Amino acid sequence: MKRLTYISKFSRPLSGDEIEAIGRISSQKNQQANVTGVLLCLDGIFFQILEGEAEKIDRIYERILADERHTDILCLKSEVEVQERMFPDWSMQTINLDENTDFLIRPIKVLLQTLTESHRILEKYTQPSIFKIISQGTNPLNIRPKAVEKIVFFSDIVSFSTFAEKLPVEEVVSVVNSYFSVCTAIITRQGGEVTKFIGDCVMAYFDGDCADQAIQASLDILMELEILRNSAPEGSPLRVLYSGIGLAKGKVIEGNIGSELKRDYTILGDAVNVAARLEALTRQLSQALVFSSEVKNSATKSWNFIWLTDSELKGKSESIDIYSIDNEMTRKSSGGLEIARNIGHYLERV
Amino acid sequence: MKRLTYISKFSRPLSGDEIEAIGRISSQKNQQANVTGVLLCLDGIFFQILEGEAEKIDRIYERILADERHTDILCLKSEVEVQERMFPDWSMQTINLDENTDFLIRPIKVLLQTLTESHRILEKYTQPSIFKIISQGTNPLNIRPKAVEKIVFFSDIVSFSTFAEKLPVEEVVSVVNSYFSVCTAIITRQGGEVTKFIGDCVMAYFDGDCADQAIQASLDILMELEILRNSAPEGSPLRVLYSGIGLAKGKVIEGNIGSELKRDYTILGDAVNVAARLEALTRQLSQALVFSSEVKNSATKSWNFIWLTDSELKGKSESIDIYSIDNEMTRKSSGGLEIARNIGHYLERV
Numbered sequence: 001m002k003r004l005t006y007i008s009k010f011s012r013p014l015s016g017d018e019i020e021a022i023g024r025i026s027s028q029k030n031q032q033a034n035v036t037g038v039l040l041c042l043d044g045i046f047f048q049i050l051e052g053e054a055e056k057i058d059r060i061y062e063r064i065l066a067d068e069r070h071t072d073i074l075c076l077k078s079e080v081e082v083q084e085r086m087f088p089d090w091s092m093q094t095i096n097l098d099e100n101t102d103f104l105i106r107p108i109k110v111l112l113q114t115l116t117e118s119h120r121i122l123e124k125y126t127q128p129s130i131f132k133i134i135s136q137g138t139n140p141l142n143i144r145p146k147a148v149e150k151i152v153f154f155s156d157i158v159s160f161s162t163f164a165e166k167l168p169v170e171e172v173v174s175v176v177n178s179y180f181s182v183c184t185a186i187i188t189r190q191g192g193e194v195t196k197f198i199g200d201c202v203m204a205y206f207d208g209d210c211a212d213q214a215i216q217a218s219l220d221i222l223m224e225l226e227i228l229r230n231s232a233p234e235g236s237p238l239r240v241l242y243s244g245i246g247l248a249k250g251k252v253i254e255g256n257i258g259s260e261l262k263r264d265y266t267i268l269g270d271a272v273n274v275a276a277r278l279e280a281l282t283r284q285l286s287q288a289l290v291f292s293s294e295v296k297n298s299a300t301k302s303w304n305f306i307w308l309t310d311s312e313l314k315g316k317s318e319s320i321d322i323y324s325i326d327n328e329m330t331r332k333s334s335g336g337l338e339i340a341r342n343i344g345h346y347l348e349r350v
Numbered sequence: 351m352k353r354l355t356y357i358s359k360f361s362r363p364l365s366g367d368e369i370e371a372i373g374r375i376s377s378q379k380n381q382q383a384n385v386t387g388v389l390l391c392l393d394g395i396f397f398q399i400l401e402g403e404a405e406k407i408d409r410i411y412e413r414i415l416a417d418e419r420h421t422d423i424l425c426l427k428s429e430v431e432v433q434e435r436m437f438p439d440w441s442m443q444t445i446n447l448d449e450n451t452d453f454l455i456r457p458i459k460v461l462l463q464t465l466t467e468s469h470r471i472l473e474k475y476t477q478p479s480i481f482k483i484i485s486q487g488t489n490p491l492n493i494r495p496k497a498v499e500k501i502v503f504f505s506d507i508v509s510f511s512t513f514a515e516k517l518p519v520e521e522v523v524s525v526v527n528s529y530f531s532v533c534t535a536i537i538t539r540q541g542g543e544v545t546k547f548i549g550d551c552v553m554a555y556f557d558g559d560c561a562d563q564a565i566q567a568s569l570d571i572l573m574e575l576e577i578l579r580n581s582a583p584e585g586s587p588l589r590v591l592y593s594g595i596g597l598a599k600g601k602v603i604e605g606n607i608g609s610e611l612k613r614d615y616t617i618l619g620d621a622v623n624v625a626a627r628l629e630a631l632t633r634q635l636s637q638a639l640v641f642s643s644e645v646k647n648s649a650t651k652s653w654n655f656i657w658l659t660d661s662e663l664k665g666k667s668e669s670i671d672i673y674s675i676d677n678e679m680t681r682k683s684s685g686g687l688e689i690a691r692n693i694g695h696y697l698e699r700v
């Protein structure tokens with residue numbers, strides 16, 4: 001069997017009658033599918049366990065994911081190879097804890113509430129990739145470090161210190177958060193992983209054989225930022241939000257790095273500084289995207305590559321050749337140093 | 351009144367008789383102190399709520415913190431100004447959920463277990479400072495960004511890429527984690543906050559008026575690393591673990607920075623790059639610690655300052671004067687570039 005456990009938040013106020021009505025329908029349908037489980041609610045949070053044959057469970061879960069009456073859905077546990085039903089008598093038992101007043105329940109309710117509030121806050125400070133691992137039955141704190149080949153992505157905002165000195169603090173933070181949201185959505189869609197924010201820079205990585213997807217993410221980010229600049233409100237600082245991107249490939253160490261108070265599951269190795277140094281080169285070029293020959297040679301599609309005969313990196317073992325993509329964007333960009341001048345003059349007047 | 355809620359982990363296996371024995375004693379003592387509450391256990395995790403007069407609660411809690419039968423104690427909620435008792439009949443009610451088999455309890459137990467396992471894992475990926483705020487009744491996700499004066503601390507491991515290429519991956523990670531633990535313990539003891547790990551670098555900050563404490567942390571870190579080098583086992587890579595430290599002071603923005611998938615409560619501003627650039631200068635000097643004139647001039651004790659007439663920073667508005675502390679360590683260090691040579695030759699033979 002399969003057994004799923006998830007929690008979610010009310011999308012809107014729901015009465016006890018409305019909740020009982022959801023239970024009735026759930027029971028009617030689960031009974032037909034030979035599915036059992038329990039549904040609990042407390043102070044605007046749903047908890048549910050559902051168990052049955054795998055295909056049927058996936059179908060039910062897809063409908064539940066589409067239900068507009070809850071949101072912020074998070075699967076806490078996905079058990080496959082289940083051997084015995086936990087609630088064999090219950091097609092769907094509904095337990096509204098708001099309305100319960102039993103003796104021993106009362107202290108458990110309070111503990112359940114306090115832990116849930118805490119857990120839903122921590123979710124926002126922790127990586128989604130960590131939760132997936134937990135829900136698959138693995139404790140990520142016990143994963144051993146390993147050497148692995150990756151593509152490292154590094155981006156940073158051009159002349160950001162100008163923002164921080166000409167605008168109110170709420171507006172500065174609003175710009176960086178918009179930049180970080182744009183990058184995360186695209187990188188995640190292309191199969192990559194944002195692993196660290198560093199001031200105004202984004203560090204992310206892709207599998208060692210995904211150069212195509214890292215290149216595609218980079219071009220889509222740059223295109224998304226152009227669209228944002230041209231459609232921003234009059235006087236918006238987003239009109240002068242520009243980025244540079246660098247990509248490198250190499251063997252890195254992946255694992256739990258940190259102290260006893262706080263760790264991250266992240267990567268370590270020379271490819272990280274190489275991507276950082278490449279990203280910094282975009283400040284002296286019209287190209288907003290540069291990447292190493294190792295990335296270029298690992299790609300499998302016929303990209304419009306251009307070889308930049310200006311490889312003047314530092315801290316490189318034996319120097320590396322540098323490439324970019326030649327597209328309309330790059331040919332119609334006025335150069336990194338002139339853009340920093342343009343940012344100052346514009347923000348000095350908003 | 352005051353009401354405390356905490357969770358903890360069994361330090362060792364405990365029988366149901368042993369647990370009931372803890373309850374008996376708790377009841378006897380809480381009754382004398384006019385304290386009430388509840389104690390629950392499940393699968394080796396304690397949960398407790400205790401409520402009463404504030405001074406008495408603090409005293410009870412200090413004894414509980416010293417009890418060697420549980421560990422990993424975390425306060426989830428500290429309520430002051432409480433108006434009504436939650437458990438007025440219960441000096442200390444003990445509820446052993448392992449032994450419970452009531453109808454409606456069973457599903458709640460399962461949900462409580464799953465959330466607790468998840469919560470105790472996320473704790474290790476999130477900053478302790480976040481939990482303190484939550485336990486005081488504030489949701490940190492709703493704190494507004496603010497401009498504030500801070501001391502920024504930046505440290506990094508000398509010639510780390512040599513470690514990563516000469517040693518097995520488990521040993522590389524073990525070294526960086528030891529470095530990060532040494533720094534965190536000292537910085538936290540001096541009232542500072544480690545906010546980010548970046549590859550092999552530590553970023554931390556202190557209040558704007560705590561230059562003395564940031565300087566003291568820096569000297570204690572360097573002294574702790576020397577002691578570690580000289581007492582490491584024969585052939586240990588820790589014998590060639592060296593660090594550089596840079597400190598700067600300025601106005602930064604503090605708040606929630608990130609995307610919708612993941613944010614950090616951290617800082618942003620020019621003082622961060624200034625401390626980074628200062629830290630990098632230690633690679634060309636015998637000094638392992640350098641800091642800006644703003645830090646020097648903000649300190650209130652009579653430190654053995656030395657003015658370094660070599661201020662050749664880049665990206666600085668109008669250049670800055672650079673200082674260090676002249677002590678035995680610095681005068682008996684053979685210089686940054688010779689140390690990187692020494693690290694390679696030693697690790698090439700372990």
Ligand SMILES: Cc1cc2nc3c(=O)[nH]c(=O)nc-3n(C[C@H](O)[C@H](O)[C@H](O)COP(=O)(O)O)c2cc1C
Nearest residue numbers: 022025026029030046050060063064067069070092
């Ligand atoms: C908290 C919550 C839990 C739900 N649990 C179930 C369930 O266990 N089984 C089910 O078939 N539908 C469940 N639903 C409802 C489905 O989302 C969907 O409305 C229903 O399956 C559609 O049935 P219908 O096509 O007959 O109207 C749940 C909805 C909510 C908000």
Ligand SMILES: Cc1cc2nc3c(=O)[nH]c(=O)nc-3n(C[C@H](O)[C@H](O)[C@H](O)COP(=O)(O)O)c2cc1C
Nearest residue numbers: 372375376379380396400410413414417419420442
């Ligand atoms: C989970 C756990 C919960 C406890 N709760 C209480 C409590 O509520 N009140 C109390 O006085 N001692 C409590 N204790 C025990 C104290 O740690 C300590 O042993 C006791 O107060 C000492 O009493 P004594 O000096 O009479 O031996 C608890 C211990 C554990 C492991």
Ligand SMILES: Nc1ncnc2c1ncn2[C@@H]1O[C@H](COP(=O)(O)OP(=O)(O)OP(=O)(O)O)[C@@H](O)[C@H]1O
Nearest residue numbers: 268269270272273276507508509510511548549550
């Ligand atoms: N610009 C960067 N941004 C983020 N992480 C970086 C950056 N540069 C390096 N790292 C990380 O730090 C690790 C160590 O690189 P670093 O630049 O500190 O070199 P090093 O060999 O330690 O020499 P140094 O003596 O200059 O500190 C790298 O493996 C990478 O994981």
Ligand SMILES: Nc1ncnc2c1ncn2[C@@H]1O[C@H](COP(=O)(O)OP(=O)(O)OP(=O)(O)O)[C@@H](O)[C@H]1O
Nearest residue numbers: 157158159160161198199200618619620622623626
């Ligand atoms: N070495 C660094 N390590 C960590 N964070 C840094 C570092 N340098 C800068 N930052 C953070 O990034 C923010 C932006 O600094 P950055 O170096 O990107 O300057 P900038 O004005 O954006 O110019 P550029 O066009 O060179 O990117 C700084 O305010 C600081 O918060």
Ligand SMILES: [Mg+2]
Nearest residue numbers: 156157158160
């Ligand atoms: Mg920048």
Ligand SMILES: [Mg+2]
Nearest residue numbers: 156199200201
């Ligand atoms: Mg930057």
Ligand SMILES: [Mg+2]
Nearest residue numbers: 506507508510
């Ligand atoms: Mg280093």
Ligand SMILES: [Mg+2]
Nearest residue numbers: 506549550551
């Ligand atoms: Mg480094």
